[PDB]
Design an enzyme around this catalytic site. Structure first.
Site, PDB file in Angstrom:
ATOM      1  N   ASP A  82       0.861  -1.214   0.000  1.00 54.26           N
ATOM      2  CA  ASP A  82       0.000   0.000   0.000  1.00 54.26           C
ATOM      3  C   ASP A  82       0.889   1.254   0.000  1.00 54.26           C
ATOM      4  OD1 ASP A  82      -2.343  -1.523  -0.082  1.00 54.26           O
ATOM      5  OD2 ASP A  82      -2.707  -1.337   2.093  1.00 54.26           O
ATOM      6  N   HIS A 116      -5.563   2.782   3.515  1.00 58.12           N
ATOM      7  CA  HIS A 116      -5.448   1.301   3.612  1.00 58.12           C
ATOM      8  C   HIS A 116      -4.232   0.958   4.476  1.00 58.12           C
ATOM      9  CE1 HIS A 116      -7.696   0.906  -0.521  1.00 58.12           C
ATOM     10  NE2 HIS A 116      -8.477   1.393   0.454  1.00 58.12           N
ATOM     11  N   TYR A 120      -3.836  -0.696   9.023  1.00 53.44           N
ATOM     12  CA  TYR A 120      -3.077  -1.805   9.662  1.00 53.44           C
ATOM     13  C   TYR A 120      -2.479  -1.299  10.978  1.00 53.44           C
ATOM     14  CZ  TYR A 120      -3.901  -4.080   5.237  1.00 53.44           C
ATOM     15  OH  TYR A 120      -4.508  -4.622   4.148  1.00 53.44           O
ATOM     16  N   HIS A 210     -10.226   0.342  -8.033  1.00 50.47           N
ATOM     17  CA  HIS A 210      -8.872   0.756  -8.494  1.00 50.47           C
ATOM     18  C   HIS A 210      -8.432  -0.172  -9.631  1.00 50.47           C
ATOM     19  CE1 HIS A 210      -7.864   2.647  -4.275  1.00 50.47           C
ATOM     20  NE2 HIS A 210      -8.950   3.173  -4.848  1.00 50.47           N
TER      21      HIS A 210
END
Ligand code: FMN
Ligand code: CA
Lengths: 313, 139
Positions: A82, A116, A120, A210
């Site tokens: 990411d 994104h 995490y 995407h």
């Protein structure tokens, strides 16, 4: 007509200073598909703070140190991909846009893939110790098999071939993370880390668009090339996917060593490799058998896959 | 008299799947100022465009699942009465909103949801939809 005797700023900046610049025109739109995608990705805006994963603590605490480490490593590995796509891959697409709105959509993509990556961190903050977090960072840095994957894609982003850059931009959200996304769906099928998999579902809701969008723009450009160059680009796509599938398998066999998940995770990866090819307009060569995963795990991705005002009437 | 009515946006995923099927097909126009008139039985094949919306309540928001052009088609009762069944497409990565144009149309028309597929479809999808359409027009 002002549009045909002017360039967008990003065209002016990198490719053609011989003409004056036109402001973006959102009132006269070249491609309705751009408006459809813009409205959806902006209306789908989310932040990980609004999914509290503190309800995962019970199921997380029941996992042994090895499983906790596997999750932290897998997710830190996804964070790297990411980070690559947000800081290089999606912003590199802006200057190679066919339309004005595409320039803004890829700015949205670059931001949302940053979200994104950031999500995490939100999971680690709730579940992980400082030692588990730092160990996972060291492991990602020192894992050659992991590093090989982004190292293969980045050169297409920094090179001058816009079509190869676009293919790389599609392959990242279309394929490369699904081997890791298998794990949260494996766990939530067993009632483990259920809130974490809600974050994963919000990420996939972005990544699916995407992949679609980069695939759609790829097709509009290749359709204009000669049949010979169209054939050359197809060979390049299949050759790159072969190489990336090779690197991903090596990585997942190491990642899932002693957990027995590699087989299923690789089949989930190839399922998504097939969807990557389709959204580039190429047939998937993978059998339903070859891309099969356990029903209870697939139901965590989509229960609709199946137990686990203008209307006048 | 095997016939497909389908909708496909400019991306033409559903268009390409339908062009691989054995049965004749008619395309619902993208332009909202154009309508078509169908006077023969058909299976309807459409993609999903809800975009994985969720309500305040928390359930799947099916608003926009069915493309506006498909609603305009089905709003004409002459068109609507000829639908034997619906096949919907999308992408499983939309999760609980995967292919939900099918269930929506199935509920509104009171016709079977015959099949669900993704993007341009696989060999297996072509073979299955070829068989299911045949059996729909036979039984
Ligand atoms: C803005 C947007 C929203 C979408 N929403 C959904 C959805 O809610 N459910 C789904 O299964 N697929 C969804 N998809 C995937 C499309 O249905 C899929 O790409 C389909 O193959 C497109 O068909 P077409 O090219 O014939 O229009 C969406 C795609 C886009 C671009
Ligand atoms: Ca899609």
């Amino acid at each position: 007509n002002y549009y045909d005797r002017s360039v967008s700023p990003v065209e002016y900046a990198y490719f053609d200073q011989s003409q004056n610049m036109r402001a973006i025109n959102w009132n006269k739109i070249v491609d309705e598909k751009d408006l459809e995608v813009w409205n959806r990705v902006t209306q789908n805006f989310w932040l990980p703070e609004n999914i509290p994963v503190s309800n995962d603590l019970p199921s997380w605490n029941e996992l042994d140190d090895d499983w906790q480490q596997l999750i932290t490593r897998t997710f830190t590995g996804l964070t790297l991909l990411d980070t690559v796509q947000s800081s290089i891959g999606d912003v590199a697409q802006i200057k190679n846009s066919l339309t004005e709105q595409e320039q803004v959509i890829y700015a949205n993509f670059a931001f949302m893939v940053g979200v994104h990556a950031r999500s995490y961190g939100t999971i680690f903050s709730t579940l992980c110790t400082s030692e588990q977090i730092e160990e996972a960072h060291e492991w990602v840095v020192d894992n050659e098999a992991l590093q090989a994957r982004p190292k293969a894609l980045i050169p297409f982003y920094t090179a001058d071939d816009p079509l190869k850059s676009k293919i790389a931009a599609a392959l990242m959200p279309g394929f490369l993370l699904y081997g890791g996304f298998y794990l949260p769906f494996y766990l939530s099928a067993r009632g483990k880390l259920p809130n974490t998999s809600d974050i994963i579902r919000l990420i996939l809701r972005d990544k699916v668009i995407h992949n679609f969008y980069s695939g759609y723009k790829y097709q509009l450009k290749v359709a204009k090339l000669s049949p010979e160059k169209q054939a050359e680009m197809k060979q390049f796509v299949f050759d790159l996917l072969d190489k990336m599938i090779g690197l991903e398998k090596t990585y997942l066999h190491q990642l899932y060593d002693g957990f027995g998940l590699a087989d299923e995770a690789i089949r989930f990866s190839l399922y998504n490799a097939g969807k990557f090819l389709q959204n580039l307009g190429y047939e998937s060569p993978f059998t339903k058998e070859e891309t099969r995963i356990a029903p209870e795990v697939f139901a965590q991705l989509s229960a609709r896959a199946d137990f686990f005002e203008d209307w006048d009437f | 008299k095997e016939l497909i009515v389908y909708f496909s946006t400019q991306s033409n995923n559903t268009h390409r799947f339908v062009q691989k099927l054995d049965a004749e097909s008619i395309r619902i126009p993208i332009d909202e100022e154009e309508r078509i008139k169908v006077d023969e039985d058909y299976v309807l094949i459409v993609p999903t465009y809800s975009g994985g919306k969720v309500t305040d309540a928390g359930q799947v928001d099916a608003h926009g699942a069915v493309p506006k052009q498909v609603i305009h088609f089905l709003n004409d009762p002459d068109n609507r009465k000829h639908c034997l069944g619906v096949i919907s497409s999308g992408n499983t990565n939309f999760g609980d909103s995967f292919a939900i144009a099918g269930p929506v149309i199935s509920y509104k028309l009171k016709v079977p949801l015959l099949y669900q597929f993704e993007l341009i479809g696989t060999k297996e999808d072509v073979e299955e939809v070829n068989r299911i359409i045949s059996e729909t027009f036979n039984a």
